[PDB]
Design an enzyme around this catalytic site. Structure first.
Site, mmCIF file in Angstrom:
data_model
loop_
_atom_site.group_PDB
_atom_site.id
_atom_site.type_symbol
_atom_site.label_atom_id
_atom_site.label_comp_id
_atom_site.label_asym_id
_atom_site.label_seq_id
_atom_site.Cartn_x
_atom_site.Cartn_y
_atom_site.Cartn_z
ATOM 1 C CE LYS A 18 -3.437 2.079 2.434
ATOM 2 N NZ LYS A 18 -5.095 2.032 2.019
ATOM 3 C CE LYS A 24 1.179 1.345 5.585
ATOM 4 N NZ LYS A 24 0.275 1.829 6.288
ATOM 5 C CD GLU A 46 0.992 -8.500 16.720
ATOM 6 O OE1 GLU A 46 0.809 -7.976 16.980
ATOM 7 O OE2 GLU A 46 0.709 -10.307 16.879
ATOM 8 C CE1 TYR A 47 7.051 -11.985 9.658
ATOM 9 C CE2 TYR A 47 7.829 -13.234 11.495
ATOM 10 C CZ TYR A 47 8.181 -13.212 10.783
ATOM 11 O OH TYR A 47 7.996 -13.941 9.502
ATOM 12 C CB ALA A 48 1.301 -10.965 11.323
ATOM 13 C CG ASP A 65 -10.533 -0.525 4.623
ATOM 14 O OD1 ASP A 65 -10.662 -1.696 3.618
ATOM 15 O OD2 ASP A 65 -8.807 -0.741 4.076
HETATM 16 O O1 LIG Z 1 4.365 -13.369 2.160
HETATM 17 C C1 LIG Z 1 5.403 -13.752 3.194
HETATM 18 O O2 LIG Z 1 5.426 -14.302 2.981
HETATM 19 C C2 LIG Z 1 4.509 -12.523 4.353
HETATM 20 C C3 LIG Z 1 4.977 -13.145 5.110
HETATM 21 C C4 LIG Z 1 4.860 -12.536 7.017
HETATM 22 C C5 LIG Z 1 3.811 -11.215 6.501
HETATM 23 N N1 LIG Z 1 3.840 -10.455 7.963
HETATM 24 C C6 LIG Z 1 2.847 -9.030 8.144
HETATM 25 N N2 LIG Z 1 3.239 -8.775 9.259
HETATM 26 C C7 LIG Z 1 3.517 -7.902 9.857
HETATM 27 C C8 LIG Z 1 2.726 -6.566 8.794
HETATM 28 C C9 LIG Z 1 2.947 -7.054 6.884
HETATM 29 N N3 LIG Z 1 2.497 -6.229 6.035
HETATM 30 C C10 LIG Z 1 2.030 -6.410 4.746
HETATM 31 C C11 LIG Z 1 2.986 -7.691 4.385
HETATM 32 C C12 LIG Z 1 2.852 -7.388 3.140
HETATM 33 C C13 LIG Z 1 1.299 -7.766 2.378
HETATM 34 C C14 LIG Z 1 0.373 -6.682 2.774
HETATM 35 C C15 LIG Z 1 0.767 -6.417 4.095
HETATM 36 C C16 LIG Z 1 -0.017 -5.553 4.882
HETATM 37 C C17 LIG Z 1 -1.254 -6.473 5.481
HETATM 38 C C18 LIG Z 1 -2.599 -6.427 5.914
HETATM 39 C C19 LIG Z 1 -2.475 -4.900 6.701
HETATM 40 C C20 LIG Z 1 -1.364 -3.664 5.866
HETATM 41 C C21 LIG Z 1 -0.652 -4.496 4.921
HETATM 42 N N4 LIG Z 1 3.292 -8.320 7.383
HETATM 43 C C22 LIG Z 1 3.260 -10.938 5.322
HETATM 44 C C23 LIG Z 1 3.413 -11.248 4.967
#
Ligand SMILES: O=C(O)c1ccc(Nc2nccc(Nc3ccccc3-c3ccccc3)n2)cc1
Length: 266
Positions: free
Chosen positions: A20, A39, A88-90, A133
């Site tokens: 984004k 970000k 936070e990292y997901a 959203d």
């Molecule tokens: O593809 C992977 O390997 C991968 C592994 C772990 C991740 N985990 C993760 N953690 C925190 C923030 C985040 N943002 C994003 C990253 C990529 C695309 C969209 C978003 C997003 C999502 C929701 C809201 C705003 C941004 N993604 C993400 C991707």
């Protein structure tokens, strides 16, 4: 949260990104070795779309929310060139990608996601944050595979009469938002129905090839179920998608739904 940060405090990892407008990176804070997500926004073209306020509404809101199903924003900072969000990292990535891979979710995974969703929304609404959203792209997965709500930028304080020129599809927006009227927490319950449908079907229920015909189908609430969608699923979704916000059930009834309690792990 007294501490103020800088890029020199972080080691930047893999791009998760193109986020984004500018990307999201894995990162590690050097002293703690704490793994998290950064970000990154160039700030010239955030300025040029005049989102500078909407971004710090996202930041403020998402800062004060503590829930296991809501993605944390730990803080932020900036240099002349651009602005950084410490998140936070997901670890398991976006629900969107998981849906592209499986192409659809079974009733047990779907019911679990919805449960987690309703829980996070109950919490948001208690503070009268309404997300507005909710879509698979805004949903992230934690280490235990638990759902996490992110991207609170468009979120608001209820009720809202807001202007807010619309972007992402129309697919997740209810009639009251697209017709530019007053709206409340019930907005998120419609999105929940859209989401529940998409999870099981693989496609959002109002999906169409043009923005204009999607508007039509949302306004008239025209959706059909493929044969494999079970009676209990149809029932919950039909309850969630109602032109009249007041005919939509409370999150509590959602959580108490026979189809939910049957298939939900939670
Ligand atoms: O593809 C992977 O390997 C991968 C592994 C772990 C991740 N985990 C993760 N953690 C925190 C923030 C985040 N943002 C994003 C990253 C990529 C695309 C969209 C978003 C997003 C999502 C929701 C809201 C705003 C941004 N993604 C993400 C991707």
């Amino acid at each position: 949260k007294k501490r103020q940060w800088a890029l020199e405090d972080f080691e930047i990892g893999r791009p998760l990104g193109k986020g984004k407008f500018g990307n999201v990176y894995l990162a590690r804070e050097k002293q703690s070795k704490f793994i998290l997500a950064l970000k990154v926004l160039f700030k010239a073209q955030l300025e040029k779309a005049g989102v500078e306020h909407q971004l710090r509404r996202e930041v403020e809101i998402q800062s004060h929310l503590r829930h296991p199903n809501i993605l944390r924003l730990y803080g932020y900072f900036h240099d002349a060139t651009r602005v950084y969000l410490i998140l936070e990292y997901a670890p398991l990535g976006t629900v969107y990608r998981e849906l592209q891979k499986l192409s659809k979710f079974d009733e047990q995974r779907t019911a679990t996601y919805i449960t987690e969703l309703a829980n996070a929304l109950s919490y948001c609404h208690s503070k009268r944050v309404i997300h507005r959203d909710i879509k698979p792209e805004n949903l992230l997965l934690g280490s235990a595979g638990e759902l996490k709500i992110a991207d609170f930028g468009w979120s608001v304080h209820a009720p809202s009469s807001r202007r807010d020129t619309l972007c992402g599809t129309l697919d997740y927006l209810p009639p009251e938002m697209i017709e530019g009227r007053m709206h409340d927490e019930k907005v998120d319950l419609w999105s929940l129905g859209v989401l529940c449908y998409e999870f099981l079907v693989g496609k959002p229920p109002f999906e169409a090839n043009t923005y204009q015909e999607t508007y039509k189908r949302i306004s008239r609430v025209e959706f059909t179920f493929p044969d494999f969608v079970t009676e209990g699923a149809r029932d919950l979704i039909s309850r969630l998608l109602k032109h009249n916000p007041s005919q939509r059930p409370m999150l509590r009834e959602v959580l108490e739904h026979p189809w939910i309690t049957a298939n939900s792990s939670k």
